[PDB]
Amino acid sequence: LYCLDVGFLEQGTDDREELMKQASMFMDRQYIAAIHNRLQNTQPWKSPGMQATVRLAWALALRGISQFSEVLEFSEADEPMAEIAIGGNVFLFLTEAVVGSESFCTDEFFIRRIHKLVTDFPTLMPMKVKQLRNRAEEDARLIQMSMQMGNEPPASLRRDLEHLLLLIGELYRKDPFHLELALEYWCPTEPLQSTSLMGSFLGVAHQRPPQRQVLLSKFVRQMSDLLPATLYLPYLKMLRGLASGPQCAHYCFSLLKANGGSSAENLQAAGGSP
Amino acid sequence: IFKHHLDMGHNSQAYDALTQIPDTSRQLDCLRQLVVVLCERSQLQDLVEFPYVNLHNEVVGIIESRARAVDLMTHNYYELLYAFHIYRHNYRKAGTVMFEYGMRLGREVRTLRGLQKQVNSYLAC
Amino acid sequence: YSQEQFSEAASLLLSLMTARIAPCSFWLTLLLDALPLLEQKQVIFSAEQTYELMRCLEDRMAAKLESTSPDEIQKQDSSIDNTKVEMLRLALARNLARAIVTEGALQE
């Protein structure tokens, strides 16, 4: 994970080009092509969880590479790799095997790497984010009609966003180091102030976080207002995860206060958060 | 002629050139030009000491629209319409500007600087 | 004041009001003190300075309204004194327009 940690590539970075030159992936022209061809080939995978993991990771890597590469650029295999990854429910595999292990709390770098992987996943695949959001909504609709007719939900159920909600919520009750990486998901554009927040720009006008985290916490802020009932609980796992820590708790308090007040979108179990 | 007056900074002379202008549409356009350039040139005293008449409503509309348009901190057009209201003895109207801008601060801003400013505005009105 | 150090005059006055000094019959004089500062036809004070100045002016104003009675006033001086209040704050606000235009032009 650290070797593949290339998070500077999400947007154009001033240091990105030199990180590219002293990065092995690009100084080896055969690196990216070799792993791409091998992964698209057939290899033994004793755990589909880690197989999905590797497909997802190499897909995000190629997605980041493509935006500033033209000859080491691959964007064709990312879609099947990503679909295999989500279908194999890599989310629960990583939730259980890695995080559930207390061998995972040994170094802060573990938490850091997973956090930037978490921030990586949505920014590179916004189309997949929208598709899965709509697919979860239609899953809610199908379950609603099945309950109305007294039957079971049709065919199989895919709950990958549910897995993500459960996973990240669980993640942010597990840290001794108190890294406050959830405060990132708390942009200081959100109106909130304390007797220690004068060093922030909530006592002084204006502050804009980096684009990726702005997108993440903003999509969070809209999900505060749009919810299908099938995802009501894992979203609540979001909530209890983020509920750890005093300042993140104050931020989430502010967010639910925004969800507070008279409305028509926090009064609904579908299309909003009941 | 007006724009040349602007170029060499004869502000009273530009004002006279503007008062010459028959058409109210071009009057409004050049009024907008004047306001923008005087704001960027930090020439505020010009704007107030102008003794406009029958153009007061044009200026009021222009300045309120730009108040809709501007940032609260990097632009002071509400305060400009304020001081206009004082210059024209507009007690109720300057109060309206202050309370309105305090509401605007309450909406846009939740900082302590804001807090000072909403208090200032509500109090002033 | 008699030697015209208005800046330190304002400093001392702001300090003593935010000290909230003197009894009710003498916050009368505390209020009365601001008149020459009103008389300033030329000022060097900051816009923030004018802020806290007037801030405290009406702060003490409401406070005097309530010190008389917690919802009323009963002192014989207040009425015509209130009249002076309106005229003085008139002059104040006009000079406030003056000070703010000067300060904004001070940034030129």
Curated annotation (Swiss-Prot), chain C:
It is found in: Nucleus, Nuclear pore complex; Nucleus membrane. It comes from the Eukaryota. Coiled coil: none annotated. Transmembrane segments: none annotated. Disulfide bonds: none annotated. Component of the nuclear pore complex (NPC). Component of the nuclear pore complex (NPC) that seems to be required for NPC assembly and maintenance. Involved in nephrogenesis. Belongs to the nucleoporin Nup85 family. This is Nuclear pore complex protein Nup85. It comes from Xenopus laevis. The gene is nup85. The chain holds residues 546 to 653 of 653 of the full protein.
